[PDB]
Amino acid sequence: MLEAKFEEASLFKRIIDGFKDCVQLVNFQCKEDGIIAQAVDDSRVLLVSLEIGVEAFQEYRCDHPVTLGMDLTSLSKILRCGNNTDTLTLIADNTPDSIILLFEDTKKDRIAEYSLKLMDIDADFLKIEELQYDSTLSLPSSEFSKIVRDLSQLSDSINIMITKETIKFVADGDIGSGSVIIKPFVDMEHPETSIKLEMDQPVDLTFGAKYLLDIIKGSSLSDRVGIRLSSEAPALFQFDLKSGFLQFFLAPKF
Amino acid sequence: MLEAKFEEASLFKRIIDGFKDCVQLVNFQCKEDGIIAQAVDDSRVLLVSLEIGVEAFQEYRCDHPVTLGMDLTSLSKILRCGNNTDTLTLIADNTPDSIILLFEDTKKDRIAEYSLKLMDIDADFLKIEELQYDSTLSLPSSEFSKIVRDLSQLSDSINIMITKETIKFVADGDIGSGSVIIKPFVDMEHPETSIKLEMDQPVDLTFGAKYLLDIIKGSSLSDRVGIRLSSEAPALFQFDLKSGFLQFFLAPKFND
Amino acid sequence: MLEAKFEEASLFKRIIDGFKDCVQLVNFQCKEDGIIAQAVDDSRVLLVSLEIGVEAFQEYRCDHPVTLGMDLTSLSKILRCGNNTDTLTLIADNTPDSIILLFEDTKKDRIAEYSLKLMDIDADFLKIEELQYDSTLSLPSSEFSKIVRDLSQLSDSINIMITKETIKFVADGDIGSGSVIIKPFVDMEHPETSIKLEMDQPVDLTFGAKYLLDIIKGSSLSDRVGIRLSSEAPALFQFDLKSGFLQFFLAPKFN
Amino acid sequence: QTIMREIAGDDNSYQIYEVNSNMNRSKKDLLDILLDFTTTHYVK
Amino acid sequence: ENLPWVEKYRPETLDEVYGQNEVITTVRKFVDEGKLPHLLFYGPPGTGKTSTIVALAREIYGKNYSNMVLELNASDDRGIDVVRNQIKDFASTRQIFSKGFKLIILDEADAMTNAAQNALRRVIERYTKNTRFCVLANYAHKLTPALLSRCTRFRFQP
Amino acid sequence: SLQLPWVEKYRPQVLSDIVGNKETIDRLQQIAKDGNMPHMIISGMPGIGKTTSVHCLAHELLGRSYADGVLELNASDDRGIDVVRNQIKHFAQKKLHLPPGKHKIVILDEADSMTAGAQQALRRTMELYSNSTRFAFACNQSNKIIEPLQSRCAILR
Ligand SMILES: Nc1ncnc2c1ncn2[C@@H]1O[C@H](COP(=O)(O)OP(=O)(O)OP(O)(O)=S)[C@@H](O)[C@H]1O
Ligand SMILES: Nc1ncnc2c1ncn2[C@@H]1O[C@H](COP(=O)(O)OP(=O)(O)OP(O)(O)=S)[C@@H](O)[C@H]1O
Ligand SMILES: [Mg+2]
Ligand SMILES: [Mg+2]
DSSP: OEEEEESOHHHHHHHHHHSTTTOSEEEEEEOSSEEEEEEEOTTSOEEEEEEEESTTEEEEOOOSOEEEEEESHHHHHHHTTOOTTEEEEEEEOSSOSEEEEEEEESSTTOEEEEEEEOOOOOOOOOOOOOOOOSEEEEEEHHHHHHHHHHHHHHOSEEEEEOGGGOEEEEOOOSSOOOEEEEOOOBOSSOTTSBOEEEESSOOEEEEEHHHHHHHGGGGGTOSEEEEEEOSSSOEEEEEEOSSEEEEEEEOOOO | OEEEEESOTHHHHHHHHHHHHHOSEEEEEEETTEEEEEEEOTTSOEEEEEEEOGGGOSSEEOOSOEEEEEEHHHHHHHHTTOOSSSEEEEEEOSSOSEEEEEEEOSSSOOEEEEEEEOOOOOOOOOOOOOOOOSEEEEEEHHHHHHHHHHHHTTOSEEEEEBOTTOEEEEEEOSSEEEEEEEOOOOOSSOGGGOOEEEESSOBOOEEEHHHHHHHHHGGGTOSEEEEEEOTTSOEEEEEEOSSOEEEEEEOOOOOO | OEEEEESOHHHHHHHHHSSTTTOSEEEEOOOSSEEEEEEEOTTSSEEEEEEEEGGGEEEEOOOSOOOEEEEHHHHHHHHTTSOSSSEEEEEEOSSOSEEEEEEEOSSTTEEEEEEEEOBOOOOOOOOOOOOOOSEEEEEEHHHHHHHHHHHHTTOSEEEEEEOSSOEEEEEEOSSOEEEEEEOOBOOSSOGGGOBEEEESSOBOOEEEHHHHHHHHTTTTSOSEEEEEEOSSSOEEEEEEOSSEEEEEEEOOBOO | OHHHHHHHSSTTTOOOOOOOSSSOOOHHHHHHHHHHHHHBOOOO | OOSOHHHHTOOSSGGGOOSOOHHHHHHHHHHHHOOOOOEEEESSTTSSHHHHHHHHHHHHHTTTHHHHEEEEETTSSSOHHHHHHHHHHHHSOOOSOSSOOEEEEEEOGGGOOHHHHHHHHHHHHHTTTTEEEOOBOSOGGGSOHHHHTTSEEEEOOO | OOOOOHHHHTOOSSSSSOOSOHHHHHHHHHHHHHOOOOOEEEESSTTSSSHHHHHHHHHHHHSTTHHHHEEEOOSSSOOSHHHIIIIIHHHHHBOOOOOTTOOEEEEEETGGGOOHHHHHHHHHHHHHTTTTEEEEEEESOGGGSOHHHHHTSEEEO
16 A cells, blocks of 8 residues: 655665654654654654655655554664665555565565554644744754754753844853854855855744754754744754755744 | 964874873963973872973963863863864963864865863862983883783783883783783884883882773874883873873882 | 794684684693694584694694693683784693793794683593594585575574585575575686585485584685584584694584 | 483483573573573584 | 861861870870871760871871872761772872871771771781771770771770 | 781791680691691681681692682672672682692681672582682671581581
8 A cells, every 4th residue: 555665774764863862753644745744742842844755765656645653762673674785665554553664685585574563643733833934044964963062061051143144052051151153154165065144033042952952863864954043933943855854843942 | 362273183182082081170271381281080090291382383372371171071072073174273361261262274264163161170280209210211102002902901910020121011810921021122214113221220110900001092192102110109101292292190009 | 841833823813713702611632743622612512623733833842742721712812912923832831730822023022922821621522433424515615604694694593405416505484585506516717616525315404503603703714614414413514724624513403 | 410320321421501500690691502402412 | 267166276286186195195106106007096076086187197298198198987978889999099009109108087987887897907907018097986886896906996085 | 117016927827826726726737737628617706816727727738829729808809799700710710730639729708798699609619619629718707608608618616
């Protein structure tokens, strides 16, 4: 009933590990245009959204929408058995009680099959809480991962200020303080690294250090990350890996 | 206030490679002639003294003395993100409260600055009680590290014996014994691997495996290590540098 | 009272790495003809008996026979110190207490001498006799090791088929089955890659995969392995050497 | 042991894997060894 | 200043310890002779055992006092294993020192158990040459007699 | 410097100089002279000469092989279950050549402080390796040692 073959199992491993530490139980509703996964964290501060296109699959023949609820820890345990030159195929029947994760090798002498039961999570709806964002910026994800990890040591709360078209991170700690400011810089010899910025309204948002540490885990997906900040709407942290979409929503702590 | 400029960024990493495990917290005393630091371990066994000269500075100004303490773990945690192309730059203000290090490249405008708070211990001491030693010897650091690591599996005590015109390492343990003897030789084709020695008094003191392994792990700091041995006195382990040297005081073990 | 000098440092390291993972206690029995060591795994399934002739040493005195019983792990840790460009010298004495290993070199200044305390082991000496096993074939060690490694992941037991001059390894599992069939042949360009076979009666046996892996760990000593099996006698895997041999005695299962 | 001497008739004929408390009786340290001893034959 | 007088008026030397005279004279004889055996101060609280021994240790150990003594307490949140590790690490080290004879300041030994006291006396046996022990207690009936036989027993009176 | 105390300066180096318990001392002297040292648990009040007696017995039994034939386990060194399972077993498995009648010596002073599990693991390694090494216990209280150890030793009161 469902038969989608991944281009490479490493892509699936990375996209699963991107939000593995954030949430635990997710629902995979797969449609004609692709597969979408949405869930909410226990503390109701974090919202996770997934969207993988059909062009990243070698073969895709899903002919009806179906929701796939399945845990992430056992999924990680299953995908840990994959190899570098092994493709992953997802198999579901008309009455899905178990999902077959079949691994195919270039040589037909090695076939690996793994099956797991389905979980029934009460799936929600697309928030569509997204509203125009005051500031948009893009920068390579590694630098923000390092900056977030360094700033989380100083304090449990990190403030982001984009006033006067300057990207600055402030985290006032009990025993210390820090301030890193990055100006919009565009490089021509290395298009991979660039700092774009568009300013409409001043932004002053404070997030949690643990939440941002969970966010920065998915840095293995895309070279650069686009950040959308709004005064009222939750921040949009989108990873663009060119095969699928991964966006993270964080409610500001007031 | 303080401007410490490093032409090569790897120098600080290959210096703090020895510091990252030996002492938990160290303070840097910055003077007009360079940066010095002295630390004592928790068990007060090993004393580590660091000296940095002006030669390893592109530009330097330290007109007023600076008391700068920090954690080495966080120092290395900020340091490992430095690339081989960017240059280093240490900046401090009047009565510093947070050290900042700057990364700058030459062909692209890549600026990477990071803020690190300072650790206050209220403990600062410098001492040089005695200098002359009964034996003078030097050997490659890689060979010494290999010998120590291979002899560490047999026993926790290593006896570095200096008989006439030879070096002897003795380690007796439960599973067996080990004796590694090396003679001073001069390789004129490759002087880096040459071993030189002059002797005044016999040397028969022992050491500990863990601390001296901590000593040998810093072999990346200098391919040649200077060894100072003298009776009734702790040893000195010197690693050569273009602007200074990093030296260790490792205590002997009571034997009778 | 012992003085055996290997012509190269890597030979003894390789020959002790050949059977290090299966047994933990080895009983060297150095005598006048050469050094002989026998060892039995802790499960007493496979027996490792090693024989080395006098021609494998630069010099070898051994005026009186003596038995040396030591642990694999400590010996291996001692040899891991020695560089490959060295000449190991095995030194012992009458009524052995500790074995002395001397690491000489062309550069006499860099020389190392090590000592290892022996272990008190009660050897269960066995009479190894050349029995009339039904099958006898010799195949290159690399191909056998690759086949065993490939078939290990499919089943815990490996089955052999020796019938009508055909070599087949069988590994059947729930997920699937893996069979490799190769025929005997002689190659003039490379005789070391040729396949040899001499049967007397057909044999069908099954052995564990892990023990086969432990056997093929020693495939770094010879380019070809001699296999002599019987319908009732323990499997004999012989790794030929320049001046000796290393043979493994694998025991069959029940029924 | 006396029963083994009686039934076998020789000291070396029987083989007993005597399990004591001086080693570790953990699953991951002895499981495969005991299965191998109880599954295959003893070389003699 | 604004501090409790208990630590303000401690005797900086042996001369300001009043009341007890025989033990102080024995200490002065010991320092004049040079023999410093294992000592054991016990008695009612407040007699000045800790003050006497800290005065002794300071007037012997000058400036490297802060390094070459270590003040211990059996009742802290460490445990028998941790105190044993601390004693072995402080005794079997032979650090950068001008003069040897390492001193142990181990207070409140009345709460020490039999096994801990046996370990302490065994460490005393093994490291007598380099380290000297001056374990401090308050009641002599709560200590095993094997520990009493290895220290110069000095009773303290009110 | 320091003066040697008379408790250690005049410590008897032989079993003959030790006074008290004449029967046991004479039997220990006979055992040292002949050989075949038995397993015993020396029990009694502290300070009566048990550790000195067992040390003198080990001296007279071995001689020059004292250093490599005796493994002393006191309260200062760790004596946990891992110690009994590894180092005592290795010392028993050690191949040391002795004149006939003599055996390797394993002394566990203040054995009353031993944990129960370490004693439980100790009985099997002393029963199996009784042909090469012999154990010697010296504890203040004999009731702190479990019954299986007393069943394999001749308790000395
Ligand atoms: N003989 C003395 N002369 C002067 N001051 C004394 C004398 N004895 C005690 N003190 C003081 O009384 C206080 C008691 O301090 P400590 O000597 O530490 O008490 P202690 O006698 O060791 O008993 P404890 O309860 O075990 S701490 C300190 O302030 C001492 O300076
Ligand atoms: N009968 C004796 N003859 C001579 N010296 C003795 C005698 N009994 C004890 N000693 C000495 O008194 C001291 C006591 O030391 P140990 O023998 O260790 O005491 P112990 O009897 O083992 O009891 P401990 O050690 O408190 S558990 C040593 O110096 C002995 O030499
Ligand atoms: Mg006190
Ligand atoms: Mg005693």
